[PDB]
Amino acid sequence: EDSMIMNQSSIDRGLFRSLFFRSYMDQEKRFGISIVEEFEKPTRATTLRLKHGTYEKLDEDGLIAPGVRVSGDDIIIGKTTPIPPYHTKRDASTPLRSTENGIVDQVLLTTNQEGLKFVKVRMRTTKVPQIGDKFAS
């Protein structure tokens, strides 16, 4: 019924193996004259409603570095937003998609048209053919 048997040794030598890339984008938003979000590694003492994942792969600039393996729900971009009227900020960080893993490949840092900070994190992993994957002549 239209399935197929594949030679496992062929897969081992590299048949139909492929790279997969995903990019995440984030930027700081403006809410007032001097009220801006800020990239940082958020301290648990000063920021409320933190995510459940680990923050231990972020460097001090709020950005993860290339070469580090990441798994689902890990934070890779730390960002906070202040709470209007210490202990004043709220987490606005971006976790890796729960179903994925791989290696951080490259991190772009720049500014956008409005002058605030702007980052992109590209993650790469390798997908190896397995039972259930789809092929066609």
Binding site: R69, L108, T110
Partner: protein
Amino acid sequence: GVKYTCGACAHNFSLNKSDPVRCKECGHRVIYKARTKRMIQFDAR
């Protein structure tokens, strides 16, 4: 503090986040984080 790399002239330098986001050498506004200090292992499979 954190190593970066200029997207145009490849000069390396650090920034302690409050500095403006540019290259000291050429003024290029696209920069990249340098790789982690940690060792990376792969199983070669």
